[PDB]
Amino acid sequence: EMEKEFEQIDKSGSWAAIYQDIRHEASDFPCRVAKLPKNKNRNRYRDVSPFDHSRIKLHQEDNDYINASLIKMEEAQRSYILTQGPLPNTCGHFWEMVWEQKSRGVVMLNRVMEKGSLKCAQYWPQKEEKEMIFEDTNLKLTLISEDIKSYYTVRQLELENLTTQETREILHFHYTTWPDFGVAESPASFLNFLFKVRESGSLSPEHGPVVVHCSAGIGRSGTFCLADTCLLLMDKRKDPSSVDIKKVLLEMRKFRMGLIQTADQLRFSYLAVIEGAKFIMGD
């Protein structure tokens, strides 16, 4: 049981050492498109770029670059798009990607402002009567409804391709209570949030991949998809105890660098999977 490894790592207080080992073993692939001069202002952080082989390409010949990666989990049969929080100049690209990739859900794990700085542009409308038009990509975005809860908020958005006037409903799942520093004591509310996304259909194979982002698109975003995939694998396998979280994380890091940004986040991912596995187990 992953839980035994957990308590072992706890007794010997070796979380930084386990986490460091993941950093060392993680894949390294080129990110040459991300690093081209003409793309400097499409990247929020210099040290966080999508690998060329897994990057999402916008369907435009001007510049197809967005800082976003397709994380395709073979065995789990789940795909995710991990991206950075949009920039003042990349909100049109963001919604273009959502349109072109046929996503049904957007999962946002940060607040627009955290620790007194902007982590992300205000990329969706806050009022029904003031829609947003992204002129560079010819999309219209309308707030349809908003359900604010204690730990998260779910919004129904209407995205319209102004070129063809097709419309789709996008579900926006906004986790609003990740603490500014470190991680929560109990994974309970994070798990609750994950199940709400799942229940929405947003993760389901009839749709394009869910779009997941925080500020850089690797820390909280990595936690979300790591926990989801681990739980999915435990449900599907004949031997659930066979699910190795470290091996899943390294597989995911083949598709985007830096997933899980601290040993705290690693430990929390364990916690979430272990606690979550209890519902998944039959209770």
UniProtKB/Swiss-Prot annotation:
Oxidized on Cys-214; the Cys-SOH formed in response to redox signaling reacts with the alpha-amido of the following residue to form a sulfenamide cross-link, triggering a conformational change that inhibits substrate binding and activity. The active site can be restored by reduction. Ser-49 is the major site of phosphorylation as compared to Ser-241 and Ser-242. Activated by phosphorylation at Ser-49. One of its GO terms (cellular component) is early endosome. It catalyses: O-phospho-L-tyrosyl-[protein] + H2O = L-tyrosyl-[protein] + phosphate. There is a cross-link at C214-S215 (N,N-(cysteine-1,S-diyl)serine (Cys-Ser)). Residues 2-276 form the Tyrosine-protein phosphatase domain. The active site is at C214 (phosphocysteine intermediate). The modification Cysteine sulfenic acid (-SOH) is found at C214. The modification S-nitrosocysteine is found at C214. The modification Cysteine sulfinic acid (-SO2H) is found at C214. One of its GO terms (molecular function) is insulin receptor binding. It is found in: Endoplasmic reticulum membrane. Interacts with EPHA3 (phosphorylated); dephosphorylates EPHA3 and may regulate its trafficking and function. Interacts with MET. Interacts with NCK1. Belongs to the protein-tyrosine phosphatase family. Non-receptor class 1 subfamily. This is Tyrosine-protein phosphatase non-receptor type 1. The chain holds residues 2 to 284 of 435 of the full protein.
